[PDB]
Amino acid sequence: MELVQVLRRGLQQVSGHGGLRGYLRVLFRANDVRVGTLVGEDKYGNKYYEDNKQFFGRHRWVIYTTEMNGRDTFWDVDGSMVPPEWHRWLHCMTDDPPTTKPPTARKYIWTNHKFNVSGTPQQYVPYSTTRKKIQEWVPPSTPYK
Amino acid sequence: TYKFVNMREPSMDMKSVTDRAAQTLLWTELVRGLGMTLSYLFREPATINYPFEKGPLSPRFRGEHALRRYPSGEERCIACKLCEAVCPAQAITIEAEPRADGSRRTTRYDIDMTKCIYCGFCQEACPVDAIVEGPNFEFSTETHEELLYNKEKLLNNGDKWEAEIAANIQADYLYR
Amino acid sequence: RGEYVVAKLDDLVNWARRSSLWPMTFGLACCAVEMMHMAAPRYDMDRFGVVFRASPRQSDVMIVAGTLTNKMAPALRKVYDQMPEPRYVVSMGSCANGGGYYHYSYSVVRGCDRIVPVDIYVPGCPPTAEALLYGILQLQRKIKREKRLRIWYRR
Amino acid sequence: MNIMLTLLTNVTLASLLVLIAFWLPQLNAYSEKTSPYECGFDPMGSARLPFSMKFFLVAITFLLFDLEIALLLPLPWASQTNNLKTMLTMALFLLILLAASLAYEWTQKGLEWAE
Amino acid sequence: FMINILSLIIPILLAVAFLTLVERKVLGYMQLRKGPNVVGPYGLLQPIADALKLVTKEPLRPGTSSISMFIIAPILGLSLALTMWVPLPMPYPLINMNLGVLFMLAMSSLAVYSILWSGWASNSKYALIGALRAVAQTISYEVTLAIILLSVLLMNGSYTLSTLITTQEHIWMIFTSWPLAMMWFISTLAETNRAPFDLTEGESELVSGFNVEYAAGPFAMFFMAEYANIIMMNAFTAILFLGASHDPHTPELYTINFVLKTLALTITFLWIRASYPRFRYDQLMHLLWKSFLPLTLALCMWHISLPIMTASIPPQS
Amino acid sequence: SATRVIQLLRNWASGRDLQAKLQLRYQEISKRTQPPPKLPVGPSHKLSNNYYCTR
Amino acid sequence: MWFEILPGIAVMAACLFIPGMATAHIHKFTNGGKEKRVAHFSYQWNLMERDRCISGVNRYHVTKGLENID
Amino acid sequence: HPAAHGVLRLVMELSGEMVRKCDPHIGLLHRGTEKLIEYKTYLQALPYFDRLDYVSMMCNEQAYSLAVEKLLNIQPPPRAQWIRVLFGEITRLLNHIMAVTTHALDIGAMTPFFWMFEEREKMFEFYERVSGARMHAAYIRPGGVHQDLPLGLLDDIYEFSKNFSFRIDELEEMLTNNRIWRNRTVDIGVVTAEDALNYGFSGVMLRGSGIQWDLRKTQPYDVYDQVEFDVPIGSRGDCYDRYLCRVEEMRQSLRIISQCLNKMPPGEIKVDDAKVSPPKRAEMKTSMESLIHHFKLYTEGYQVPPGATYTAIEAPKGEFGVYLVSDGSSRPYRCKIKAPGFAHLAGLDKMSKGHMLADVVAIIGTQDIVFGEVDR
Ligand code: SF4
Ligand code: SF4
């Protein structure tokens, strides 16, 4: 009886994951077919799930978005689309989603969380943050006195 | 007190000796490791799904540096240079200047990660909690010049990483 | 269109390259033991499709992990040059990135890049097993973003 | 000639694999890559010096024993003869003779690695 | 006719390729890991990914190597493994062969020669030593393998592989020569160069043994060769002891039974690979010449007089 | 957290009750939402009679 | 989750399938339904020549029964 | 080499495969650690010891911490010492996990390596919970630990220690009873009683040889006197004995965890003397004395009186110690690191005699050579 119980669990798995198209989407992109409660959904389209019944370290997980700042990422992904409010929840630094209690919003925090800009033209470059220290004596503008 | 580890003379009894002989001829203790290994195969693997899934962390984690700022907006750093004096690899270089107003912070605040050790000493050395060890372990890059930040990006890092540390020091301000 | 065809063969080449690249079993210092930490079942090196091979004639990407010293230098360059192309190098930890905690030491070369070309600089000291496992991922993305036979077609 | 056809095909199919694995996948050699491997460093310089065995004694006994087994390969056909009586004694006699030779070598040291 | 040859050769290569996936995946599941699953569904696309990347990798020709010797050995290794798949009594053998096992045994000894030659052809310590450990490994198993081979089929009637199906028939052959199968199985382990007896490779001891200067395509033919060798000789031990029933009107009924017999047995080859440390080739020739040889004589004497014992001499035809 | 039949298989192949406690972690761990602490003062935190010359 | 192992076997088992019945099917096809006749001794081999000769179409695997004689 | 256990140049002059000479050229990793020690202050010098050996994170600065404050005539608070010994025993588990499994890795079978590195990672999980990072905590400092453990950490320690005893049995089932492991291991590499301590060996090297010596019992330090445990003593001095003592030390380590867990006392976490330990953050932002001390402590460092000391603790390998020599200023003058591996690798020539090339692979793992520590 338990054998067909796990068979219907797979049949539930394909049904609950948006039918066949969604299941093939997560199987070939999300690399996993597990189904979890919709804990939250940020402004970037990143879909988040929580399954407290699973063993530790596999309770809270993320399905990444297909679009971020014109950096189409339906197939390729990396561990940096996660916004700062949710990045602590994903790493279970805490047992609260930002939806339950949002972080203290202030003026200067970024409105669009970015990722590693390495390789892209938006990459950082080191530069002097100090002014000139020894400025030279400017030659006189007048001709021979 | 001590416990002797390796000496147990085997009994030469007919039953005991045929046990060792059966163990020798018929691989029995040998298949014991083989047999248990089967039992461990059926265990579900303890593998996370990176980056879709990330390992557990703690609020007092050391990652990339991020210069924070006061709720008004003024950056906390006040150029006491204690972080520079403590930095075990001298990854910090500090220059200061009184500019015009209540904002003389740094002429230069360069943190050199490929020199830095990630000891976090700068974080608790700061009297105003300006420089902190951020919770982001994920700041890899392709060029060597990338792996050093200027003062500006420390501000941008503190600006971009702001909600996480604000809550992290909120939970950890009594421990330290 | 010729560019369409070359792009398709380009897609075939890097996908095999980034899926089946083989890191070197090379380890020097504190970073090496954390490198095998993620190879442990918690993070599963192999589930991303890579396996550890030993000799230079065997592997794809050099994974430099640990402090680089003057005495270690001749062998590292010899072993790196001994790897057939294509070959990539990632630099574990602050020490191998450049200098590190012993940047000012007499017996430490300030940078593995001073000896061998580097693709990715994975920071942290030691880098957490999560961070470098992304470093492999970034190299998969970097391997994806090439036009080797495509630049040849327009060459 | 059926065995010839599969033998020819087999060695052919192997040769294509080495053929396109030597020309198609680029070529770039600059000496130190071409150099021998000594776990990172430069070899003492040889790979041709006498690598003297320490088990030379057992090697020749293998030749005697691998030879003598060829004497008892005809056993399946040797069973189906009208004279299994002397067949049993002679075939047994060979196995004791190998057993005695193994026993002889065993007792006078032999199989254990010569040092 | 050649259509039969390709259908005998081509599926083996894909089967060998998918052996690399299970090698890296059931081991991982047997090791708390999840195995390769990032490339396609559950990693089934990984064996393909290995194939092209190895082929497109740069071939390497060491300066001190003998060029002709460096190339002939990989050809010999892969060709023998592939041609090893023609004579098995898989329901309708490609070539009926009176001396089925002798054909099996002869080129199995020639297979190690490709293993043998590559060591010095690469011209270094780490391959010369691995090549010479191949000498001692085949010093041990060859002196006894023929004895086990003779003993098991002495009740069959002849050396023909096809008669194995007739001989077994009602009951599994292992039920009659179980201590021989104990002898035979792990001696095949000692020739395929698997974990307990892989001194020719020797991962930890000498980097890679007879592979150190090998790269790209030459390995691809070498990797497939030894993976083809283990599956084929496992299929050999499948028919040697676990031969199933064969209905002439429905030959496919034999294939489904035979395939699982050589497949579950293969899982064992991956099973020992995880659980057991490495034999030192000192005890390898020591063990196979101290206990293995004196024992295998005794049952060989047992298995010859015993057809005479009960008037159970098998017919040759 | 698997089927009972395989649980018997794992418990019999290894010959020990693994199901009582496993290598992987579950909800028996402490939650990571601890209440604020009230860390104690030290022995020398006495308001008087704490001259440095005596310690 | 060892049921993820089975897909590896599933294709592999099917991969081992092809040379099995094919070696039977091509034998069935090339010999006209009846299976491949084997000749381990002179009697069997001397037969195939006689069957090849008697058929009159130079095929050993086509057989003429009692209707051939009158 | 993967069997090289990192980096070293081990030249064998061997005939056939019997090693005649096995000169272990060391220093391929050399960092002038003691030289940079000279220019950094004691607080800046703490992370150095955390990076000597990559197997025992805070076992090392425990020796370094014991070097400083014991020279300083200062003692840590009783609660701090219990944290030190508790994590030192957890740290003792850390080395022994791959002191045996990576041994088995070079030996052959790789599955034991992946059995317990999962549990080794859990000890990393509490490591990161109570400290700043996973590996290099910089936690154990002179005068006491850096900060208090997070709430709920001890309960996780209890569960893990409860589950761990069921895992050494997993390794021991895999290896100890195994004949294949035994044949490659028993009587392969032996030391007599006299040459054991004549060669400067320590820890498991002596204990396997039957030498009745252990630093925890003979010369107790911190709160190790109150804890009760057993030390496994070998009978043959071969590789099998050392591996068996290493396994039994892990079991005895778990017993120490149980006693440490149930005997955690209340109180502070660092010496109340603010001149040696930084004051609390709340006091540093409010009181003058805390702020001015914090400023000068985090810009000069505590002045250590002139003198010399050779505090040595029971490292998981041997008797890892430091010959701290202070000139009286705020920075140390000379600090020479005693490495148990240094003596063990020195004796490697004596161990390998008549054994083959696979056996020397077994020996260099039975001493658990780590080349940031053996080399310094
Ligand atoms: S952790 Fe902070 S104080 Fe320490 S080296 Fe890095 S930046 Fe400097
Ligand atoms: S970051 Fe903090 S410690 Fe460093 S100079 Fe600024 S205020 Fe001082």
Ligand code: SF4
């Ligand atoms: S960067 Fe840190 S962990 Fe890595 S080798 Fe250097 S000191 Fe060790």
